[PDB]
Each structure stands twice: as C-alpha cells, then as structure tokens.
Ligand binder design. Sequence first.
Ligand SMILES: Nc1ncnc2c1ncn2[C@@H]1O[C@H](COP(=O)(O)OP(=O)(O)O)[C@@H](O)[C@H]1O
Ligand SMILES: Nc1ncnc2c1ncn2[C@@H]1O[C@H](COP(=O)(O)OP(=O)(O)O)[C@@H](O)[C@H]1O
Ligand SMILES: Nc1ncnc2c1ncn2[C@@H]1O[C@H](COP(=O)(O)OP(=O)(O)O)[C@@H](O)[C@H]1O
Ligand SMILES: [Mg+2]
Ligand SMILES: [Mg+2]
Ligand SMILES: [Mg+2]
Lengths: 65, 370, 370, 370, 107
Amino acid sequence: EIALQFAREAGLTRLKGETDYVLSNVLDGLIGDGSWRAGPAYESYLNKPGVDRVITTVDGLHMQR
Amino acid sequence: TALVCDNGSGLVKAGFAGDDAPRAVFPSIVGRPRHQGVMVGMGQKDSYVGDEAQSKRGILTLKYPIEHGIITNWDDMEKIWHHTFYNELRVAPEEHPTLLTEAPLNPKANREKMTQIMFETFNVPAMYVAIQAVLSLYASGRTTGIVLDSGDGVTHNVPIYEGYALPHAIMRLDLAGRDLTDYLMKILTERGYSFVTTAEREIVRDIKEKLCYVALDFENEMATAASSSSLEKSYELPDGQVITIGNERFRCPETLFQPSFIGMESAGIHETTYNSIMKCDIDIRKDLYANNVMSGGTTMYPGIADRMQKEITALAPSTMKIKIIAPPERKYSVWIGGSILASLSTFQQMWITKQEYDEAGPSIVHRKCF
Amino acid sequence: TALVCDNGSGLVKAGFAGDDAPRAVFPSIVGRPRHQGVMVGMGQKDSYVGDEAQSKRGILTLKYPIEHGIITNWDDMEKIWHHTFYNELRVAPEEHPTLLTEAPLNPKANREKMTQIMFETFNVPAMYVAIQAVLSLYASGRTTGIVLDSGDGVTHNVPIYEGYALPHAIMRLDLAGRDLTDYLMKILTERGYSFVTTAEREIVRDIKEKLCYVALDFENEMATAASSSSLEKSYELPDGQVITIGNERFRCPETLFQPSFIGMESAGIHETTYNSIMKCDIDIRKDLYANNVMSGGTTMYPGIADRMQKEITALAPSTMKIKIIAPPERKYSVWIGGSILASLSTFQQMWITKQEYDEAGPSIVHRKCF
Amino acid sequence: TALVCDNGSGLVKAGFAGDDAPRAVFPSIVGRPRHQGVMVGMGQKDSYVGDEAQSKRGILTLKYPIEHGIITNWDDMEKIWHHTFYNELRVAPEEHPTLLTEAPLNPKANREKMTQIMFETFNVPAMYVAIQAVLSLYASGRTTGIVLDSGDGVTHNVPIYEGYALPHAIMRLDLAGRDLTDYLMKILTERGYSFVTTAEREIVRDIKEKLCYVALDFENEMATAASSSSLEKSYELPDGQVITIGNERFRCPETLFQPSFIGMESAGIHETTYNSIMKCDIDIRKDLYANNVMSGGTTMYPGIADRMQKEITALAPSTMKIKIIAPPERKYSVWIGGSILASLSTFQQMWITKQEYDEAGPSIVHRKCF
Amino acid sequence: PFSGLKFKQNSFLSTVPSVTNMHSMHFDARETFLGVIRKALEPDTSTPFPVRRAFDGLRAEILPNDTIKSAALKAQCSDIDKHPELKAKMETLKEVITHHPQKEKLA
Ligand SMILES: Nc1ncnc2c1ncn2[C@@H]1O[C@H](COP(=O)(O)OP(=O)(O)O)[C@@H](O)[C@H]1O
Ligand SMILES: Nc1ncnc2c1ncn2[C@@H]1O[C@H](COP(=O)(O)OP(=O)(O)O)[C@@H](O)[C@H]1O
Ligand SMILES: Nc1ncnc2c1ncn2[C@@H]1O[C@H](COP(=O)(O)OP(=O)(O)O)[C@@H](O)[C@H]1O
Ligand SMILES: [Mg+2]
Ligand SMILES: [Mg+2]
Ligand SMILES: [Mg+2]
C-alpha cells in the first residue's frame, strides 16, 4: 500500500519494466503479480463526460459571452 | 424536565431529557444581510439564526459562532441559545436544568462562560457540562470502550474502562467535518467548480454529505476512477447547474486517514485511535479494541467503519479482535447520551445549581464537571 | 397627501399617493413654434407643454427634456414640472411631499438638480427619489424578483431578493422605446415612407405602438413575411395617406433582442436579464428565474413576454422554471409602486425634508435615497 | 533556446529564455469585425490578434480567450499562440522548448489542453507549465517569501519557504484588473460618462492604468475629495472629449481591499495575504512577513505597496516586521522568472518531452509539473 | 472670480429658434436670446460643485427663467446707477461670457 502510494504520488515506477533490478524485485516481493510494471492509472481531465462549463456565484460576476 | 443541548461546531441538537431524539436540530450559524436595502415593507430583520439563516443564505454572510469546538463569538452564540430555547423548544429556561456538552481538552474559559451565560442571562435553575465522548458511550449502553467522536469541529478519542476514563490517553484532532468541506472546495476546483462564498460552502457541505464516501483501498479506488467513469456521480446545484464529481468523492474523506492531504502534520483517525489505545493500560487494551465506538456526523461517510476496521487491524496485534461500533443514529448519539444522563435519578445531584454558582461563580464548572 | 411623479423619458405619470392610477399622463415634451407670425394675438405663447404641444405638433418643434432617463434640458424640465403641478394636478407643491423616480446608474447630478429644483423652485415640504425597478416590484406585490423596466429612454433590470437589492447585478441598456421609434422610421424608408420631423417621429411612435409586435421566432416570421402578405397591416396618416408595413412590424421590436440592428454591441434584453441573474448568488437564482417582472411601455409589445419566456428558457438550465410576469398595468407599474410606497406609514420617515435639505444641501439625496 | 510565454488573462508576455525582458508584449485579445462590408480589395481579415486588434478596435468586437486565468476559447487561444510564435517572435516552435505559465488552483483540463495543443498543434519538442507566483519568486531572486501576484484575471498568494511551497496555504481570488476595469466603468456613470462596448472597456482600462491609485486612508481621501477638487484629474478620450475623474481615482482600486464594492463576499488582498501567512507554520511566519513580494500589472497602482504595508501591519502582531517588495519591473517579474528558470542547466531534465507526452498523453503535465 | 467653470459645448444649439419664427410678429427676441445665452452658460457637471452653486446663483439672478423675475430685473437695471451690486454681478457675468469657449458661435 505504501509502495503504490510512491508510484502514484512520486513516480517510483516511472520506468515501467525498465525499473532497475533491485527496486523491481523489491516491488515484485510486495506485488507478486507484477502488475506494477504497468504504471499507475492516471486520470485525464480532457473530454470528461459531464463536467463542462458550470458558473458559480463568483464566476457569474465576469461571464464573457 | 431537563433540557439537553448538544452545541456542536456544525449543528445545534436540542431537546428534552428522556426523549428518543432531539426535538430541534438546526445549523449552528448566524447570518447577516450583506446586500443593500431596499424595500421598506418587508421589515428587514438585521440577523438570522439557524434554519432561517440557511434558507436566506443567498443574501447573507454565514458565520459559525463555534470554531473547532470553541465558542469564538459569544454574542452570536447567545443568539443561537436564545433561538434554541424560545423559538425551537419554546421553553422558559428559568424552569429547566440545562445539560451542555463540549469536546475534551477545550480552553477552560469556554466552559466558564457557558456556565456564566446560562445562569446570568438565561437564569437556568441548574446546569451541567458533559464530555461528548462520554455521552456517546452512555448512548451506546456501554461502560467500556474508546469513543471516536468526529463532528464538524474536532475529532477526539476518549478511552473508558468500566466507567473510568484515562484522561492522559485522550486524543484530540482539530481535523473534522469543516476541514473536509474546505478540502472538497479546494479539489472541486480541479474540475472547474469554484465555490467561494459561505453560502456556497454550505452547498459544498451538502455535496460532501451525500456523495462522499470512504474508500477501503485508496489506491484501488484511484485506479478504478482513472480507468472508468463508474465512480462518477452528478449533483444539481440550487440554480439548476449540474456538477459531476469523480475521485473527489473518496479523496475528501481520505483526508481523515491522510491528514497530510490538507497540510496537517498529524496521524489519521485510525492511527490516533490506535495511539490512544496503546497509551492505555495493557490490561484494558483488548476490551478497548473490541469496543471502538463511532460518533458524530463526520463518522457518517459510507465505508468509514469498514475502513477503520481494516486500519486498526493493520496496526494492532493479529490476535486482537477489532470491532468498530457504528450505530445508525451515531449522529445523535451524543445528544442521546445527554438525554439518558440527565434522566437518571442518580445524576440529579451532579447538577451545578444556581446557589452553588452564586457562592463560587462560574469556576464551579471546573470542580463539578469533567 | 403625497404626490407621485414618475418622470420618464417619454411620458409624465403624476398623481396622488394612495390612488390606483396616475391622475395626469401626458407626453414629456416641450414644443416651440418653428413657423412665422403672422396674425395679431396668435403667437404670444412661446413653448407648449405635454398634450397641448402634441396637439399643436404640426407647427412646433418637439423636444424631450429627458433623454435616456437623464434630464438634458433643465429649463424645459421645470416647465414640465410646473405644468404637472399647477395645470394637471392643480395642487400647490409647497403643501405636498413629492415622490419622484429615476433609472438606476444615472449621473448623480441628475438627482441633485431635481432635488434642488423641488426644494428651491417649487418649495416642496419634502421629497424622495426612488428607483423605478424597485417601485415596479412594489406594484407587483412581491419582495423578490428581477424587474425588467423598459420605457422610452432606458431599459434596466434590478434583481431583488427578500427586499435586498444586489446593486452589482443592476444592468442598463440605453436602448428603449425611443431607439425603437427611431429604428422604425429608418426601416420605413425601405417602403418609400419618409418621416423626418419631430412631429413625424411622434406619428411613427404611434405606428409602433399600434402595429409592432415581437415575433416568437424571428427567422420564421421573416420567411412568412417574405412568402406571403398575411402579416401586412395598414395605417392611416393624419392627412389621410395610408401606409402599409409588413416585416417592419416585428423587425422594429426585434432590436430589443438583437441590438446590432441599430449598430449597438450590447446583448439583447433576454441575455441581459440572464446575465443579471447569473451575477447574483447561486442560491437566489431559482427565485429570480421564476419572478421576471416586466414594466414600462416598451414591454407592451404583443409577444414580448412569450419571446422572453422562450429566450431565457434557452439560456437557463432546463430544470429551472422560467416565469415572466407581465401585468396588464405594466405601463404604470412604476407609478403604482410609488403610490404604494409614499402612502406606507413605514415610509414617512424616509422623506428628505426641507430642513435636512437646508442643513445638508442637494447632496442629502445620495444619503437618503437608493 | 527555450521560449517563455507568460500568457495571462490580459497580456501576452513572450520571449526567449535568458533575455532580461520579454520580446513580444501585446494584449491577449482576438478582434472580429462587427460592422458591414463594404469596400472590395481592402486588406480585410476575418479576425485580428493583439496589437492589430487594438488598432482597429473601433470596428471590432474584442474578446479575451482567457478570463480569470482560465482559457475559455481554445480556438482563439491557438491563434493567439500562432500570433506569438510566428508573427511576434518569428520562430519555428518545432525547435524550441516552450515554458508556459498558469495560476494556481486552475482547472486541471486547462493545463492538459495547453500541453495537448503545444505538442499536437505546434509540435514543440518539449514544454513546461510553471506557476506564476513561483516564477515571480525566481525573478525576485529569493527562495523564501509569500508572493501576491495580481494580473488581469486572478489574484493569488503563494507562500514559499526555502523553496518549499505550502500548497494548503495558497490563496486565489478571482478579483483582478479586469474586475477593477469593470468597476471603473460602472462608477464613471456617476459623472455621466458612459462606456459600454468592449472598445470602450479598453479605453476605461487606459484611464485606470494612469489615473487610478490606492489611497493610504480611504475615509480620509473620501473626505478630501468631497471637500476639494485637488484630487480631480482630466483625461482626453480618443475623440477629443475630456473627462474629469475625482474620488473614482482611488475608489476603483479600493475594490482590492474592499471586494464588497463589486458584490464579492471576500476578504481584501491584505487580509488574504495575512490569512495565507497564518495558514503557514508558526515558525516560518516571521520570514514570510518580511518577504511579501508583489507581481503583476494590478500591483502597479501608486500607493498599493504602502497600503499593503499599513494593512498587514495592522493585522500582524506589533513585533513582526512587515516588508512589501514591489520591484519596478514587477509587471514582468513573472516572465523574468520563467526566463531564469528555463535557462538553468539544472532545469533541462524537468521539461516534458515529446516522447514523454506521446507515451503518456496530456495528463503527463500533472505529474511532471506542479 | 470663477475658476474651474466648464460648459457643455453645443448645449445651446437646440435652443436657437428657426429663422422663420424669428420673423414672427410676436417673437420675443430679448427673452429668447437671453434663453439661449442662459442655456450656454449652464455649468458642465464636471465643474466643481462649490463653483457650480456659486455661478448658478449669478446666472439665475441675471438670467432667471421666470418672466416676472426677468421683467423685475429689467426695471431695476433701468436705474442701474443705484444698483452697484447689479453692476458688479453684471460685470462678473460679462467677464464670464467673454471667456466662454464658444463665444464665437454665440456672437
Ligand atoms: N451523512 C453524512 N455524510 C458525511 N458527512 C456528514 C453526514 N452528516 C453530517 N456530516 C458532517 O458532520 C458534520 C456535523 O456533524 P455533527 O455530529 O452535527 O457535528 P457537531 O457536533 O459539530 O454539530 C458536518 O460538518 C457534516 O459535513
Ligand atoms: N402598446 C405599446 N406597444 C409598444 N410600445 C409602447 C406601447 N405603449 C407605449 N409604448 C412605448 O413605451 C414608451 C413609453 O413608456 P413609459 O413606460 O411611459 O416610458 P417612460 O417611463 O420613460 O415615460 C414609448 O416610447 C412608447 O413607444
Ligand atoms: N500602471 C498600472 N496601474 C494600474 N494597473 C495596471 C498598470 N499597468 C497594468 N495594469 C493592469 O494590470 C493588468 C495586466 O497585468 P498582467 O500582469 O499583464 O496580467 P496578465 O498576467 O493576466 O497579463 C491589466 O488589466 C491592467 O489593468
Ligand atoms: Mg457533535
Ligand atoms: Mg418608465
Ligand atoms: Mg500576470
């Protein structure tokens, strides 16, 4: 759980399967399935299904177009 | 009949001792008009309290008189108390002893001024200030257990064994619901939803209450939200605009277990409860582990009880049986306990009476109340 | 009794507080002879005011002392006010406190001068200057809503909620009936009709009031007018000549929603109303959407409310309930509200008195009046 | 070498890393003709960017593709960037790493779109998105201090200590120069001056930039202006009209310290800086108090630094030494820091490269940059 | 006497009668022309308020709207030798007129 927080927040697993030998095996020890070699699943904020164009109270004070 | 008023940082739970639930529950807010004029006929009251403030929030600045368990505006607090007695419970305080509550490790002046105001401006025949964790244990029907009480203002742990508190093992954490509301505001801007005003803080609090949940495995939920839209839920704002919220649903409550999310150098509620237990005598730890009692609104997130079990189990020795007690009415458990306490015949001598207040002054509250 | 004088750009609506309608409604015009001589005894009267100027229109040059809700000719405005007091109401102004009106966001000298004249020229015991949108909301009975006021000089909307105005949300467009009158005589030249004098402008105003309407969908109405003669209406000029107008009937009012017709960059009244609402707190928007109240002559076009209903519904989120309130007494709502306001017992202390004026001068108006 | 493009809400500051000042500074505006026709063979275009849009402002509608720090028109942003690279810097973006900037607490889609367009449209070999306040500290040459950056779109505070930011203490107010320009437009109507078009908004911006100043004592200045004309200055409009402006000179920028002027329920910039410091660890507050560094055009008001010194000194304990750092070049300090940052050899491995992008996609920006 | 006094240019052009009406057999040339000059002497709002009030008293006294007042002033000035105050007021106003920025059009 700590190791995956490092991958999530610090890019510990940036190099994917190119991770150096000792780190990879330590990760293999903690994560036996090897799925960590596929980096963390990062979300993308582009083209999100339903997030577009909301106008709050302060936003309503500028309102171009 | 005694009056039981649980003045939390967020909500005023008030009612009568012996009842199954508080008669009046309303926000602990005083609102004042921040806009101009302009019509004469409407009367234009200068200040609003509670539900009236909440409904008119569009044109008010909302102020909480209690910050992290501490009364910070005594004028507004007296407004909230006058509203509780005369407008909500419709009682004459001169006729009822009043049981108040407050979190442990509060400033001592806070206790004294509550006593002074109740006896001097409300002329209660008697009063009492209780500890919310102790009242929650009363409401659980137990005499042993460590209560994790988390409301709007502060989270605190009180370990109790056979009715005896271990005050050296009490843990207090000013990370509570309001800080989670503020954090959600911060991360809601990541999707373009910028809430700023106090009225909009109330909307964000509403979003938190019915969309946020605690993740059992934070990394797993993060991966799920990244790779799918199955965790995304929508919320309609008062003006009809719809916001869609994804991993912010479980990232907001996650702050309770990773206070470094909001820049707080403290351990999460799981490790604080475990640290409280370990500060207790080795011979009572087994019973505390099996009697973790959740209390307060901030413990109402879906999945928080199961997360606390996983977390406390990961810290404790494997042979310990960890049990998290999360009753459905844990939001009112504190008021429920006060209702039980004030009803007991054996408690009827514990009241601070007006005579004792007169001889001793407000300092009597320290001598006669934990 | 208090006099109410709604001194609009186009019309003077004056009367006594407490009455349901103004007593004197006459054009806000001063006409002066522009022709010669030539008979003894028939020219001693220079300048004509109001209805008499409109009847002698054919030999006069007509001038409005108010343009865009702003008094531009104070000598003629004194004549208009002297006519109102002495000839139309038949009152001594020094015996009656006078409530008068103005548009929001006017120049501040406009209020100061009209206070100066009322106290120093007409010797009024007391006076007050109210905002026309606020008076319209008074007339509607409501205390919440966004009024769209559009008369002859200016169109403004004032959002009010529980009697509180949000001044940062006030909108002004210097686009009102007179601009629409001018546009109509511009597009009347397309059919070979030439109206150039001030008298002819008055008759074109008459044509606008009788034949112009707002098309629910402008493009379909243009297609209909282009494909058939069903929308043509005839009008008889004062000399017996008959003019017929087709799509000019709805192209003139369309300028309200498409100000680019007259070269203005401003947004239409529908979009201006929506922008005003969105400038308000997210909490009050739902009530504002349901309480769009129209007032003024320029909102008397047939189909204006339906068009506004449609246009605002297209801009707002689909879950909001848009309601346009267009009382049949729209044209006098402002005067009606002022009649209500001046007769309320709670308003009698808000008058600017002659004594306060003496002590403070004309600037007292900025302190006592919105 | 690397390109540095500090595209804020109001202006584009662009140039090469290592230079002392941006090479290309032009308004962040796209203008389109709002009038008709009419001459063939004229060098007419369907849109104009930057300085050319300002020149032909008279017959155009001017649109800002960025408002309150957020890119709201990505089509117009791409031609702003095409204008920057090809017409203003005369460079091929395909062979220059480009450093971009944005305000803190922006929507995350904003950075991702910026990254996507730079790699996919302009095919830059590498790029980086930095935080404007951090760049301002780079330009000041400090590694400690709380930056108040105020441009046209947003004002934000970023406290930094020994190069460590405290992101929980970052403040952001969507109240900056553009809001002040609109407020000056509003209060100019009090003197009869009307400005409603976008072109006239540019004129009012010019009036604000050279006549408005911050009052040390607002009530004293109000009394001075009310009693005398020593504070009234004149300004000649493009058509030769001369407007005289009195207390509006300091009322416009007073909105920074009293946001309620424009209906914002918010603390002034002085309180926001103090609030930001208090959210920081008690052990670093002293060094933050002495290192308040201003940046951005909206901090170029005369007397603003003195007003901040007075206001923060009144909020902090008397023993602390408040110091406001306002370099004369604080308008370009953000671009200067970007030029410094992009020229460091220690920075060259922090760029997001093209290979990084096409292996990860736009979201890479959130991992690589702040 | 009056410093900082400004006028709205062209404010008086609307006030000029048509030439044909000037030929009317009952045209009041003195009152109509004095009305034009009165309109031209209207202080611009940009004039400081103390000056506006100060001058408006001067032109209101010398160029009143009311015909009764205008006829009253006309008589009092017939024996102006006994009205040194009017002499001073009229001299002050003549000095204002001669410095009026649009004197040429007024002439
Ligand atoms: N169902 C819920 N889910 C998540 N949070 C909740 C829920 N109900 C209440 N809360 C939070 O709990 C807080 C109020 O809890 P409460 O026990 O009333 O605290 P207090 O004793 O300070 O009034 C609020 O800040 C609210 O955000
Ligand atoms: N029935 C009508 N249809 C369309 N326009 C009208 C109608 N009646 C009046 N108007 C317009 O309204 C204007 C007068 O409205 P009013 O509210 O009196 O304005 P004000 O308050 O400035 O006098 C006129 O310019 C006229 O063209
Ligand atoms: N000398 C000045 N005095 C007051 N305001 C100024 C001055 N110069 C620029 N400004 C304001 O600063 C803003 C531009 O600042 P800038 O830092 O370029 O913002 P951005 O980073 O969004 O381009 C403009 O809105 C302008 O009104
Ligand atoms: Mg509680
Ligand atoms: Mg009207
Ligand atoms: Mg900037």
